[PDB]
Amino acid sequence: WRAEGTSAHLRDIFLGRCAEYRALLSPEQRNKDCTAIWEAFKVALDKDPCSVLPSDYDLFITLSRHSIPRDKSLFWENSHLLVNSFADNTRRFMPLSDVLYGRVADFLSWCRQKADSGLDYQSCPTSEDCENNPVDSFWKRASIQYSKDSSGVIHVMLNGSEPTGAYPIKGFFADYEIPNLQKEKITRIEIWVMHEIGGPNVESCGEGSMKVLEKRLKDMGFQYSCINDYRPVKLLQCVDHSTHPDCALK
Amino acid sequence: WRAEGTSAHLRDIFLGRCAEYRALLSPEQRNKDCTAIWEAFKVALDKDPCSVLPSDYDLFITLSRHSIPRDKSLFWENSHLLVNSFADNTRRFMPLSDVLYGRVADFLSWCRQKADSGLDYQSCPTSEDCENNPVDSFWKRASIQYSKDSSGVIHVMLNGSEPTGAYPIKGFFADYEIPNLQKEKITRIEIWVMHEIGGPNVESCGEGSMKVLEKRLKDMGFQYSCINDYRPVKLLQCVDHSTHPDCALK
Ligand SMILES: O=P([O-])(OC[C@H]1O[C@@H](O)[C@H](O)[C@@H]1O)OP(=O)([O-])OC[C@H]1O[C@@H](n2cnc3c2nc[n+]2cc[nH]c32)[C@H](O)[C@@H]1O
Ligand SMILES: O=P([O-])(OC[C@H]1O[C@@H](O)[C@H](O)[C@@H]1O)OP(=O)([O-])OC[C@H]1O[C@@H](n2cnc3c2nc[n+]2cc[nH]c32)[C@H](O)[C@@H]1O
Ligand SMILES: *[C@@H]1O[C@H](CO)[C@@H](O[C@@H]2O[C@H](CO)[C@@H](O)[C@H](O)[C@H]2NC(C)=O)[C@H](O)[C@H]1NC(C)=O
Ligand SMILES: *[C@@H]1O[C@H](CO)[C@@H](O[C@@H]2O[C@H](CO)[C@@H](O)[C@H](O)[C@H]2NC(C)=O)[C@H](O)[C@H]1NC(C)=O
Ligand SMILES: NC(=O)c1cccnc1
Ligand SMILES: NC(=O)c1cccnc1
């Protein structure tokens, strides 16, 4: 297996994060059973590391699902840490990592041993090793639910400094999120193409892969808009480059 | 009493946070027993809610204590959320909330019932109800250790928009941290007096209580400097006021 092995203390972390998140839920939906959610989740840990399907996580989603505020969804590519920091634990936005079922798995890895009941802490399969591995099937199931339950203005943070372009035509956003958005429930889709401070401008709005994305969204009937280096996010990036000209204040 | 009851799922939250923090420790000190740490913490918990002393947490500290990188300490008053965000989970600085023994308690509340052995989830005592309460004694013990183990350049974030002054002569910083700093291993102390965007300029460096702080630190023999609205932090505040003139980029 060419992927990271199971995360140490997976259970304590999972339950801990689930417990903390409940407070972020409104009383009406605050009644969640972290123990039951964990039990449903670990069903993938009793199966062959290459035989886990997205649907195996149906119960897990059923027990952890909650509503996502209108206009607060944030999709992304190649911008993991910036998305989490900008979202600020649901205070500004609610990316999947800030939704209960995504929150319990952010940064984690897991899989059972090939021929043993115990968890494999050495390594886990990648899509390359085999398509139906625990982690990929989880994020497929999770991104599908996240997308279906989003409404209002859809925000997407892309990395304009990524060498392969801002929009990967193959991946979760393209293959599992875009196809599951509820057109009738969506106002418009707004893209933020972020560039590293001084970093390279590989692609900006309307260039390369961005043209492909723009065309697909528009062909699907979505109202579209793209912003290069959306200011609120640029300011966050600048916190670590305060003396850089791109970050100088008037 | 007058304070909020003990946090729900305290144990799961405690253990999860402990488990996640371990990854943030140097391999040389990553050897931490979260369950044992919890038990040591419980020693102080399972007592009369008005009979807990800082020393009751000695075992808890001993089992969770680890080193703090030189020049990475960040003390503060009246800016809890700004400090946590700026520190960015030990990435920029290591405030007490980003040190193992502080991390497991950040935002939490706890106390055992006055007459029953179970935890009191209804309410907990304040300094007013009684001085020796679980939470206050905890932070006293923790702030002492955090101060004793800090070295190099000392950073302090104060709120210059606080009505009553930037430096509270009665607070944990003044009463439990300043007196425990080890001058021998400290190079200098640097203050950042932050003002709310457009917010009020109650006090800036060299004014009111700030004069009190400067004189006390200099009387103790420390090298001192103060900065109004330290840029990196101002940029972070600006993320939420991108259009405000104080935040306009060059
Ligand atoms: O590997 P990275 O350089 O990031 C940093 C990562 O380096 C890894 O060693 C370490 O685990 C860390 O998370 O780039 P990455 O984009 O591959 O980001 C993949 C990460 O983002 C998390 N994640 C949060 N939201 C989602 C998601 N995963 C899938 N989906 C599909 C729809 N939504 C999501 C997921 O838990 C995964 O870890
Ligand atoms: O009450 P707040 O509006 O905060 C917001 C929170 O007050 C909590 O009751 C409620 O749950 C609320 O979410 O403002 P606050 O400044 O009083 O900050 C007090 C908070 O800072 C945490 N904390 C992190 N570091 C320390 C510390 N507490 C003491 N010390 C002494 C030296 N170092 C520290 C501590 O855990 C406490 O929650
Ligand atoms: C946006 O993409 C760039 C380019 O892929 C990322 O920067 C690279 O990050 C890797 C790993 O941290 C480094 O090894 C490279 O040297 C970086 N390249 C450059 C040109 O800086 C950047 O981290 C991405 N931004 C976000 C928020 O994820
Ligand atoms: C710095 O101090 C100011 C003033 O005490 C804080 O602002 C107040 O915050 C409370 C609680 O959020 C509000 O109800 C008041 O309306 C605010 N007043 C003003 C004048 O802003 C501010 O939050 C503090 N800064 C930080 C980072 O904690
Ligand atoms: N934000 C995403 O769509 C995503 C997909 C795959 C891995 N990490 C993040
Ligand atoms: N950082 C501190 O000194 C402090 C003091 C009292 C309450 N919260 C934080």
From Swiss-Prot, chains A, B:
Optimum pH is 6.5. The keyword Cell cycle does not apply. The chain holds residues 34 to 283 of 318 of the full protein. Catalyzes both the synthesis of cyclic ADP-beta-D-ribose (cADPR) from NAD(+), and its hydrolysis to ADP-D-ribose (ADPR). Cyclic ADPR is known to serve as an endogenous second messenger that elicits calcium release from intracellular stores, and thus regulates the mobilization of intracellular calcium. May be involved in pre-B-cell growth. Belongs to the ADP-ribosyl cyclase family. Homodimer. GO terms for molecular function: NAD+ nucleosidase activity, cyclic ADP-ribose generating; phosphorus-oxygen lyase activity; transferase activity. It catalyses: NAD(+) + H2O = ADP-D-ribose + nicotinamide + H(+); NAD(+) = cyclic ADP-beta-D-ribose + nicotinamide + H(+); cyclic ADP-beta-D-ribose + H2O = ADP-D-ribose. It is a lipid-anchor; GPI-anchor. It is found in: Cell membrane. ADP-ribosyl cyclase and cADPR hydrolase activities are both activated by Zn(2+) or Mn(2+), and inhibited by Cu(2+), while Mg(2+) and Ca(2+) do not have any significant influence. GO terms for cellular component: extracellular exosome; extracellular region; plasma membrane; side of membrane; specific granule membrane; uropod. This is ADP-ribosyl cyclase/cyclic ADP-ribose hydrolase 2. It comes from Homo sapiens. Its EC number is 3.2.2.6. Disulfide bonds join 18-34, 50-130, 111-124, 205-226, 238-247. Keywords: Cell membrane, Disulfide bond, Glycoprotein, GPI-anchor, Hydrolase, Lipoprotein, Membrane, NAD, Signal, Transferase. Glycans are attached at residues 33, 62, 115, 159. One of its GO terms (biological process) is regulation of inflammatory response.
